Nucleic acid binder design. Structure first.
Ligand SMILES: [K+]
Ligand SMILES: [K+]
Ligand SMILES: [K+]
Ligand SMILES: [K+]
Ligand SMILES: [K+]
Ligand SMILES: [K+]
Ligand SMILES: [K+]
Ligand SMILES: [K+]
Ligand SMILES: [K+]
Ligand SMILES: [K+]
Ligand SMILES: [K+]
Ligand SMILES: [K+]
Ligand SMILES: [Mg+2]
Ligand SMILES: [Mg+2]
Ligand SMILES: [Mg+2]
Ligand SMILES: [Mg+2]
Ligand SMILES: [Mg+2]
Ligand SMILES: [Mg+2]
Ligand SMILES: [Mg+2]
Ligand SMILES: [Mg+2]
Ligand SMILES: [Mg+2]
Ligand SMILES: [Mg+2]
Ligand SMILES: [Mg+2]
Ligand SMILES: [Mg+2]
Ligand SMILES: [Mg+2]
Ligand SMILES: [Mg+2]
Ligand SMILES: [Mg+2]
Ligand SMILES: [Mg+2]
Ligand SMILES: [Mg+2]
Ligand SMILES: [Mg+2]
Ligand SMILES: [Mg+2]
Ligand SMILES: [Mg+2]
Ligand SMILES: [Mg+2]
Ligand SMILES: [Mg+2]
Lengths: 183, 259, 127
RNA sequence: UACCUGGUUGAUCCUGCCAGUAGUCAUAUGCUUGUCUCAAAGAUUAAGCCAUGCAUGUGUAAGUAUGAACAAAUUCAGACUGUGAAACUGCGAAUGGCUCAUUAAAUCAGUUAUAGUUUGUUUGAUGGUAUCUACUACUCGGAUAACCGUAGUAAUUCUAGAGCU
RNA sequence: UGAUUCAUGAUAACUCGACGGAUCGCACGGCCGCCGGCGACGCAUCAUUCAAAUUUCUGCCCUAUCAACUUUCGAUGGUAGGAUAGUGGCCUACCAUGGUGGUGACGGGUGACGGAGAAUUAGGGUUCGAUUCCGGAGAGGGAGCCUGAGAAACGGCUACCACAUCCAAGGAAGGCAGCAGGCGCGCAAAUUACCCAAUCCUGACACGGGGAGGUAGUGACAAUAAAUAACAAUACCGGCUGGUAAUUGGAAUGAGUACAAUCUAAAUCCCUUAACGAGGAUCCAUUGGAGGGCAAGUCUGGUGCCAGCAGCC
RNA sequence: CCCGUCGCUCCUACCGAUUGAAUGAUCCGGUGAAAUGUUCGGAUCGCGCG
């Protein structure tokens, strides 16, 4: 027996059933370009997560209103959606979960947030800044654009303290140019 | 197999031990002793996993070989010694006395007890019969044998045993109206009072127990341990007093505590 | 550029005659703190007469940088450490010397000596 | 998470299949392959055959030291009481690892029984008459290992005598 | 106890009974030599624990081009014995003729170990399950057996069969479906490495040992995150606003490299980080396609039912 | 538009002397290693015995 064998893993996306739907392709390209995604796999992963959440909500809504399982899991799901900013306090019913779109999840990406608060001139600039270790959520440097920012952590986004845009120690290019200009 | 198995795979360890899936390929196999393998808590788990005195298997062995841990007032140096329900675990160096009791979720909990409360334990009688020379005796479910027992004591009763003298100082007859704790099944760790007993010839007997909050549950006779006469247990119960809380109320309490 | 040391899960282990805790190291300016400096800082903080009784191990630097976590042990005296600590940890502190050996060579020598009986068995394993 | 599209005709509506589309903790192969974290891996055909190495040994204050073993002491007495190799004694090697050939009410799953048996060990209790006229119980007897010294054989933890304890 | 002439007691005897301590370590004490503590190991009985053996009911794929099968020589049952740890045709003697079967016996096939489970998911279903957990079986094929609490053991023995090493030719030694590794087979699968540091097992044992197990090597089986560029000036275009440019400009950074520390049983990797590391950012993205299904050219050259393409048309 | 013999190439199975061959499992009868139990036997070893 190899103990590593007991670790489990799972897939995070599925390929489209019909590869060459023109309307689907146009919509997907529009979303990818708007949010600066690297490929269709990221969009399909977000769609997979949204489908899972919507299926859970739909399953719960089938149960009786007084069912303890429905109460427990619905509260858990609503709290989860509220923590990540998907739903507003007024949106306090499982029904509003079914009205969630891929755009709602995409708007919670660290890349989209970094672009929106004004730390980047463009969504692609936000991507390159994040992957280059210039952004931190709290006191932790984050380099994953897919990072889903919670409501509480949204206001803590700032430049990394060890980066040129957040502290001192300019980049290697600037240091090299300064050294060259010293002569 | 051609004989006794000496190993226990970690996935095959009882779930109430709460062993990590990726901690290793093996779990401590309980040794022979007063308690069954599936219904025990080896000293290695208590000292390492629970009390965290030892960070490793070797540290557990080192601690135990100093003769620092006592079970039922007797020093035990066996790491896989099966310590089970109602047993007393004492560490004189740290002035710690523990009693092994089931929590509402059915897992062994090291319940800290006072010095006076650490001098006795409860036992459940299996049967009473005549030994050699006609000497009557009874045996408990923790492997103990006592000669010349009180004639009133009978099977399924609870006896208060003084560890210092190894003598029965009191006993409780199994009857309706007694507070009991369930020691097996899905209701293990719950505490309530017996309401009625159903007896079926050539079959297990069913016991109906009512929780302090009015909740009702039933279990087999072999899963019921009497804790006192009437409604007052003879020993201090762990936190929760054997009251099983639904997941909804548990979540409500957790959310209230968060704020 | 000043390093800070904090302990979180403190426990006084009387059975093993030591103190066990988690170490949190804040080093915003420098890449890391070596175990020797951490040992000296712990000795200063806890007023340890003999720094040789302090053991620190299992260190991990956080992804962002400027912070690290680990585990530390402070024994009441050097003899308790020598009596309870693993050999490799003692070697790391210089209290013990590493002995060079090869397990395969030991196995082969044992197997060779298996075939010889008596006092000559001692040199039989050499071959 | 209740979905279809091309193909028989000059055209039509059908039956009906072929083809396509998607999936496999599904194998293999082709081309390509920068980084991080996980992770299967001589099952399928041959339970076919195997060079070489390793995979089972084991010592506490608490069974047995006179190594002609080492060390510290003893100026005089001392059976031995520091380490102890080797060897006898005891225990283990029936666990673990590997594979799926045989096997179709058989194995096996759930559920039963032993008032139909065995069970080193652990835990708790329990041990009363032996010589009776021999007449050690303030303690019985004979060996053997290591050791030592005569060896046999091409050869093996192959093996014979001899002297101790 | 649901249920036992059961637990258990008493008597008469019986057995040529492996039983009823000729053992060991610490200390060192009270009475007048006698008493005396804490342990170790060991023998026997019961209970308990760790288990096994046998066992009740129900449940398994295809096949009738398998309809009768079992019963001399056990088939079904009874009586009395033997054997067994124990029940039982398990075996023996005698007796009876029974037992199963279209509600599919019996026979055959399976590229059939069973299960927990895996794939796919309206629901119902279909297909898979060698492989890390549970149970069974085997150690080249059979058979027999000693030791032992426990084995019909194979990193135990004995014999035959098949292979097969050494030999001084007289003999002698064998068992990788253990970890590596080799041949063979094939479409088809890795190093003859390090370590007991973790998990646990085992021994007289706190200490030894452990190819169990872990570490590292090979590894595009499978899975996760995620680089290959971002921003301004200028020039073109389309409506201050956007798109393009191997034009200009400075900024950013990790792939790589490497002190150091960290990691680690010791190493290595990861994480952290001095000094380096980008303009055709040569630090150069590929695999398949462009009539329809099905997203994408009635572009240009060659070939001319050839060569070729084309899952289908 | 269409059927068949006949003629050519290739592919797949079918029948078939050879009282065909190999392997596996059962059936009838026979021989039968090794081990175990039993009978006899008594090299030899200790005090007429074991
Ligand atoms: K596998
Ligand atoms: K031995
Ligand atoms: K044994
Ligand atoms: K079963
Ligand atoms: K079955
Ligand atoms: K029997
Ligand atoms: K009979
Ligand atoms: K089977
Ligand atoms: K034995
Ligand atoms: K091998
Ligand atoms: K180990
Ligand atoms: K096409
Ligand atoms: Mg096994
Ligand atoms: Mg359907
Ligand atoms: Mg047409
Ligand atoms: Mg098979
Ligand atoms: Mg059956
Ligand atoms: Mg027993
Ligand atoms: Mg009787
Ligand atoms: Mg009989
Ligand atoms: Mg299987
Ligand atoms: Mg097979
Ligand atoms: Mg395998
Ligand atoms: Mg298995
Ligand atoms: Mg076997
Ligand atoms: Mg073979
Ligand atoms: Mg064989
Ligand atoms: Mg065998
Ligand atoms: Mg082998
Ligand atoms: Mg074996
Ligand atoms: Mg492969
Ligand atoms: Mg992959
Ligand atoms: Mg590139
Ligand atoms: Mg198209």
């Amino acid at each position: 027996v190899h103990v590593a064998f007991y670790r489990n893993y799972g897939k995070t996306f599925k390929k489209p059933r019909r590869p060459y739907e023109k309307e689907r392709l146009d919509a997907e390209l529009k979303l990818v370009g708007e949010y600066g995604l690297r490929c269709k796999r990221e969009l399909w992963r977000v769609q997979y997560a949204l489908s899972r959440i919507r299926n859970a909500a739909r399953m719960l809504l089938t149960l009786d209103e007084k069912d303890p399982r429905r109460i427990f899991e619905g509260e858990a799901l609503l709290r989860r959606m509220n923590r990540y900013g998907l739903l507003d306090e007024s949106q306090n019913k499982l029904d509003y979960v079914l009205s969630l779109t891929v755009e709602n999840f995409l708007e919670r990406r660290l890349q989209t947030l970094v672009f929106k608060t004004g730390m980047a001139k463009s969504i692609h600039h936000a991507r390159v800044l994040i992957r280059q270790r210039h952004i931190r959520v709290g006191r932790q440097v984050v380099n994953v654009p897919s990072f889903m920012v919670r409501l509480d952590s949204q206001k803590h986004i700032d430049f990394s303290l060890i980066s040129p845009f957040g502290g001192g120690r300019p980049g290697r290019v600037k240091r090299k140019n300064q050294k060259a200009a010293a002569k | 197999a051609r004989g006794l198995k000496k190993h226990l795979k970690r996935l095959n360890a009882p779930k109430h031990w709460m062993l990590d899936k990726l901690g290793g390929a093996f779990a401590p196999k309980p040794s022979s002793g007063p308690h069954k393998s599936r219904e025990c808590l080896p000293l290695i788990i208590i000292l390492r996993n629970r009390l965290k005195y030892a960070l490793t298997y070797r540290e557990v062995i080192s601690i135990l070989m100093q003769r620092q841990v006592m079970v039922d007032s007797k020093v035990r140096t066996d790491k896989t010694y099966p310590a089970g329900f109602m047993d007393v675990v004492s560490i004189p160096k740290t002035n710690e006395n523990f009693r092994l009791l089931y929590d509402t979720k059915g897992r062994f909990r090291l319940h800290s007890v006072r010095d006076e409360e650490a001098k006795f334990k409860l036992c459940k009688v299996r049967s009473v019969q005549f030994g050699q020379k006609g000497i009557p005796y009874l045996n408990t479910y923790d492997g103990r044998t006592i000669r010349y027992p009180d004639p009133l004591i009978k099977a399924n009763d609870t006896i208060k045993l003084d560890l210092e003298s190894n003598k029965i100082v009191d006993f409780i007859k199994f009857d309706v109206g007694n507070v009991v704790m369930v020691t097996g099944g899905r209701n293990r760790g719950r505490v309530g009072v017996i309401k009625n007993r159903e007896k079926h010839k050539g079959s297990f007997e069913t016991v109906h127990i009512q929780d302090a909050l009015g909740h009702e549950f039933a279990t087999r006779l072999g899963n019921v341990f009497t804790l006192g006469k009437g409604t007052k247990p003879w020993v201090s119960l762990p936190k929760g007093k054997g009251i099983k809380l639904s997941i909804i109320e548990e979540a409500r309490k957790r959310l209230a505590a968060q704020s | 550029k000043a390093v800070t040391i904090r302990t979180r899960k403190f426990m006084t282990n009387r059975l093993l005659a030591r103190k066990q805790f988690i170490i949190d190291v804040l080093h915003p300016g420098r890449a890391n703190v070596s175990k020797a400096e951490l040992k000296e800082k712990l000795a200063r903080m806890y007023e340890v007469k003999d720094p040789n009784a302090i053991f620190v191990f299992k260190f991990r630097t956080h992804f962002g940088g400027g912070k690290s976590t680990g585990f530390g042990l402070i024994y009441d005296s050097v003899e308790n450490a020598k009596k309870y600590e693993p050999k490799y940890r003692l070697i790391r502190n210089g209290l013990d010397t590493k002995v060079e050996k090869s397990r395969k060579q030991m196995k082969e020598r044992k197997n060779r000596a298996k075939k010889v009986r008596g006092v000559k068995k001692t040199k039989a394993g050499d071959a």
